[PDB]
Amino acid sequence: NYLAVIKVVGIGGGGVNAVNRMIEQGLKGVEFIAINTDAQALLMSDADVKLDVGADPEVGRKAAEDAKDEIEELLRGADMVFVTAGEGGGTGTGGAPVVASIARKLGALTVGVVTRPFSFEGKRRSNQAENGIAALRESCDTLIVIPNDRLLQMVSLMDAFRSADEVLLNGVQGITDLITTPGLINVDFADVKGIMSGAGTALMGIGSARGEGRSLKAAEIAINSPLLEASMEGAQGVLMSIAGGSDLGLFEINEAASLVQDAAHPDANIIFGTVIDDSLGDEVRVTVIAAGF
Amino acid sequence: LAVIKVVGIGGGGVNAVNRMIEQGLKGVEFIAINTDAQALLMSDADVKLDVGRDSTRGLGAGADPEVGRKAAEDAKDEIEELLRGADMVFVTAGEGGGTGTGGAPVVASIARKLGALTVGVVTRPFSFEGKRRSNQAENGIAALRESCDTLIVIPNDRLLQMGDAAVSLMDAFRSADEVLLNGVQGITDLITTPGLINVDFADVKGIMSGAGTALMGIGSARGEGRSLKAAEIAINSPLLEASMEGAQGVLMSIAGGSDLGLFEINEAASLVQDAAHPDANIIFGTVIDDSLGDEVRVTVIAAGF
Ligand SMILES: Nc1nc2c(ncn2[C@@H]2O[C@H](COP(=O)(O)OP(=O)(O)OP(O)(O)=S)[C@@H](O)[C@H]2O)c(=O)[nH]1
């Protein structure tokens, strides 16, 4: 109800791994759920709730369909549900749309997070990665798509893989912190629900800066992020969060908010807020989520 | 800032990883892979992956390396997803069983495909464990050698020529855990907690890339002439199998407290140079470890025979 109930579901090996990284990094205010979808292997998790329903998406779908009642029990009462298969493919890409449709049929605000692999990784048959996206799209309120190729314009191979993991985690945290963790400017969850319900595909931009003019700088970087693929101009829904320390000033906060308004489409809904994270020092971190056209 | 991951595969490797964690090895991520779910519940590793669940039903590979290989191969995408982002990957196991023997080369190949500096650290079984385990270890080692930049092989038989003569079997395997820790830590601490002489990731990569098959020696000592003593012990270690003189590549680590001075470091280094092959490439590095007290610990990795 008033403290929103947010459930983050990692499904398949990539999804469970994503959730374990969220746990290791101290992501707060959410319940973690790890769903293993493979018969032959189990990735363990320190998630609160675990379900072992076990490289084919079709296998993952059936496994989740078969466990639909149990998954529904786990999700019941959630105001918001994140679903991700994380990096890599496999059975998780088949199971994710099932978890999403259960969440949504229950009335929860349902947010998918999906990555497009780097082009250098090649491609498995049937266009199955794109098929995974479309299935998840049909099944979510908002699907946040992270095109990993765009990271190479923001690099060694190890750096590329690490960037991919970082932005994936932020695909959840940027939004959840805005809701769960107080800052000077707080948001109404109903407006989040208002802007994200039925919104469809979304893209994300991030930006970071320190010291002098940091909030404007980080915001300008986020808004121009290659991960947004220049979707900012035409976006009809924009969520923006600025994370920083307690000393984050209202004037500098408002400058960033003004910038995003000036860059967004005239008719865009804009949800804006701040997050206090005193671990950041004199750094601020902006997350922008753009949806619609 | 190098990302280092240490994989323990099979019961022996997972037990060694547990030992590494218990002894406070820092700056590395610990990954445990096994075909036994209950055994993995006891692991303190950061990442725990249970493999070959259909084929083994959580009971191990029954000493059949083919089962271990297929279990790891079946989980190769998952394993790759766990390793992605690593600059360096260690793969440790006791060779001779099914899971480690069969699975370790799969993990190493994935690491090497990703371009991570890939170092295997494995034991040969004790002769008393039987000829099938020795033969299986021998095949597992050749296989793992194809997949690693450097493969450090520790003959468990030589461990019985070290430490105490009244050891039990459990104490013997515990010494195996320790030596595996020593081989990993001897290398990783250069990078993660350097002393006065800094050997960084690029230096380690320079000497360990494609170095091939390797042997290790360890020594420690306290008090007067500790550094000379520790170095002579390591140089003469049974684990080095009297092959120090033939090695074209040597990486040496000397660990001590913050007050370990250059004179001492250099005495040990001089001793090792003198004992080395004339054309040897030797890299000398130091480690800060403020828990060591008055002791210093010298590790030698010999390759290129
Ligand atoms: N370092 C260490 N080595 C061990 C330990 N127990 C056994 N070993 C060594 O490792 C070898 C392989 O044993 P183990 O690792 O337990 O098999 P496995 O790889 O898990 O293979 P399995 O599934 O067929 S049971 C043994 O032959 C022995 O030499 C241990 O606790 N610590």
Q: DSSP letters of B27-43?
A: S-EEEEEES-HHHHHT-
A91 is in an annotated binding site: yes
DSSP run (H or E) holding B15: helix B10-22
Q: Does residue B129 share a domain with residue B235?
A: no
Rg (CA), chain B: 18
Chain A residues in contact with B3 (beta carbon < 8 A):
158, 162
Q: Does residue A181 share a domain with residue A223?
A: no
Q: Does residue A218 share a domain with residue A149?
A: no
Alpha-carbon distance of B84 to A124, in angstroms, equals 18
- The tally of domains found in chain B comes to 2
CA distance A140 to chain B (A): 25
Kindly state whether B278 is in contact with chain A, defined as any CB-CB distance less than 8 angstroms: no
Non-local CB neighbours of A74 within 8 Å, separated by 6+ positions: A7, A33, A49, A51
Q: Does residue A266 share a domain with residue A125?
A: no
Chain B residues in contact with A38 (beta carbon < 8 A):
75, 78
Alpha-carbon distance of A268 to A152, in angstroms, equals 29
Q: What is the resolution of this structure in A?
A: 2.3
**Residue B244 DSSP class:** G
Beta strands in chain B (DSSP E): 4-9, 29-34, 47-50, 88-94, 117-124, 150-155, 212-222, 249-256, 281-288, 295-303
Chain length of chain B: 305
The angle that helices B65-74 and B76-83 make with each other, rounded to 10 degrees, is 70
CATH number at residue A193: 3.40.50.1440
Beta carbons of A103 and A130 less than 8 angstroms apart:
no
The angle that helices A68-75 and A91-105 make with each other, rounded to 10 degrees, is 60
Kindly state whether A41 is in contact with chain B, defined as any CB-CB distance less than 8 angstroms: yes
C-alpha closest to that of A184 among A238, A243, A237, A239: A243
Q: Choose one of B190, B210, B230: the last residue of a domain.
A: B210
Beta carbons of A65 and A39 less than 8 angstroms apart:
no
Alpha-carbon distance of A282 to A64, in angstroms, equals 45
For A71, how many CA atoms within 13 A lie in the half-sphere containing its CB? 31
C-alpha closest to that of B204 among B215, B216, B192: B192
B13 is in an annotated binding site: yes
Alpha-carbon distance of B285 to B281, in angstroms, equals 13
Please state whether beta strands B281-288 and B249-256 pair in parallel, antiparallel, or not at all (unpaired): parallel
Q: Does residue A252 share a domain with residue A184?
A: no
Alpha-carbon distance of A244 to A259, in angstroms, equals 18
Atom of ligand 1 nearest to the CA of B64: 24
A8 phi, psi to nearest 5 deg: -105, 115
Chain B residues in contact with A20 (beta carbon < 8 A):
47
**Mutational test site, ligand 1, from B51, B53, B123, B171, max ligand atoms within 8 Å of CB:** B123
For A263, how many CA atoms within 13 A lie in the half-sphere containing its CB? 23
Please state whether beta strands A237-244 and A283-291 pair in parallel, antiparallel, or not at all (unpaired): antiparallel
Q: Between the CA of residue A190 and those of A4, A275, A290, B116, what are the distances in Å?
A: 10, 18, 17, 46
Kindly state whether B49 is in contact with chain A, defined as any CB-CB distance less than 8 angstroms: yes
Residue ranges making up the domain that contains B267: 211-305
Q: Between the CA of residue B162 and those of B79, B166, B238, what are the distances in Å?
A: 36, 11, 8
Residue with tokens 């029954």: B62
User: Atom 9 in ligand 1: which residue has the minimum CA distance?
Assistant: B94
C-alpha closest to that of A204 among A190, A189, A224: A224
Q: Does residue A41 share a domain with residue A22?
A: yes
C-alpha closest to that of B123 among B101, B102, B148: B101
Q: In what order do the strands lie in the sheet with B150-155?
A: A42-43, B47-50, B29-34, B4-9, B88-94, B117-124, B150-155, B212-222, B295-303, B249-256, B281-288
Non-local CB neighbours of B64 within 8 Å, separated by 6+ positions: B98, B102
Alpha-carbon distance of A238 to A266, in angstroms, equals 12
C-alpha closest to that of B272 among B217, B214, B201: B217
B253 phi, psi to nearest 5 deg: -115, 130
C-alpha closest to that of A129 among A176, A92, A74: A92
B295 is in an annotated binding site: no
DSSP chain A: --S--EEEEEEHHHHHHHHHHHHHTT--S-EEEEEE--SS-EE----SEEEE----HHHHHHHHHHTHHHHHHHHTT-SEEEEE--SS-SHHHHHHHHHHHHHHHTT-EEEEEEEEPPGGG---GGGHHHHHHHHHHHH-SEEEEEEGGGGGG---HHHHHHHHHHHHHHHHHHHHHHHHS--SS---HHHHHHHHTT-EEEEEEEEEEESTTHHHHHHHHHHT-GGGTT-TTT-SEEEEEEEE-TT--HHHHHHHHHHHHHHS-TT-EEEEEEEE-GGGTTEEEEEEEEE--
C-alpha closest to that of A269 among A214, A204, A197: A197
Alpha-carbon distance of B150 to B148, in angstroms, equals 5
Q: Does residue B106 share a domain with residue B186?
A: yes
C-alpha closest to that of A112 among A88, A90, A89, A134: A134
CA distance A88 to chain B (A): 7
C-alpha closest to that of B31 among B97, B91, B94: B91
**Mutational test site, ligand 1, from B7, B9, B14, B15, max ligand atoms within 8 Å of CB:** B15
Distance between first and last Cα of chain A: 31
Question: Tokens standing for A211?
Answer: 């010291």
Residue with tokens 């390759």: B303
Q: Bridge partners of B123?
A: B94, B154
Sign of CA dihedral B4, A26, A74, A201: negative
CA distance A24 to chain B (A): 9
Q: Does residue A75 share a domain with residue A185?
A: yes
Whether B85 sits inside 8 A of A17 (CB atoms) is: no
**Residue B243 DSSP class:** -
Chain B residues in contact with A157 (beta carbon < 8 A):
114-115
A186 is in an annotated binding site: no
Q: Choose one of A168, A198, A228: the last residue of a domain.
A: A198
Residue with tokens 């209202």: A250
Residue with tokens 């191969």: B73
Q: Does residue A85 share a domain with residue A192?
A: yes
Whether B49 sits inside 8 A of A43 (CB atoms) is: yes
Q: Which amino acid does the sequence have at B228? A: L
A49-80 burial string, b = 16+ CB within 10 Å, else e?
A: ebbbbbbebebbbbbbeebeeebeebbeebbb
Residue with tokens 């753009």: A290
**Mutational test site, ligand 1, from B64, B99, B159, max ligand atoms within 8 Å of CB:** B99
Q: Does residue A213 share a domain with residue A193?
A: no
Q: Does residue B48 share a domain with residue B165?
A: yes
Alpha-carbon distance of A213 to A190, in angstroms, equals 32
Q: Specify the 3-state DSSP secondary structure of B164.
A: coil
Other beta carbons less than 10 A from residue A10's beta carbon? 33
Other beta carbons less than 10 A from residue A221's beta carbon? 17
Beta carbons of A71 and B59 less than 8 angstroms apart:
no
Q: Bridge partners of B130?
A: none
Beta carbons of A268 and A218 less than 8 angstroms apart:
no
**Residue B129 DSSP class:** G
Q: Does residue A243 share a domain with residue A177?
A: no
Alpha-carbon distance of B176 to B63, in angstroms, equals 19
Q: Choose one of A142, A167, A198: the last residue of a domain.
A: A198
Q: Between the CA of residue A43 and those of A87, A213, B85, B113, B152, what are the distances in Å?
A: 14, 44, 18, 22, 28
Beta carbons of A33 and A49 less than 8 angstroms apart:
yes
CATH number at residue A248: 3.30.1330.20
Question: Tokens standing for B203?
Answer: 């230096």
Alpha-carbon distance of B59 to B206, in angstroms, equals 41
> Cα torsion for A95, A101, A104, A105, to the nearest 10°?
-130
Q: Bridge partners of A51?
A: A35
Q: In what order do the strands lie in the sheet with A200-210?
A: A49-52, A31-36, A6-11, A80-84, A109-116, A142-147, A200-210, A283-291, A237-244, A269-276
Alpha-carbon distance of B100 to B72, in angstroms, equals 10
Alpha-carbon distance of A142 to A136, in angstroms, equals 9
Other beta carbons less than 10 A from residue B178's beta carbon? 17
User: What's the angle, vertex CA B259, arms to CA B258 and CA B264, rounded to 5?
Assistant: 120
CA of B97 to the centre of ligand 1 (A): 6
DSSP B45-114: -SEEEE--HHHHTTS--TT-HHHHHHHHHHTHHHHHHHHTT-SEEEEEEEBTBSHHHHHHHHHHHHHHHT
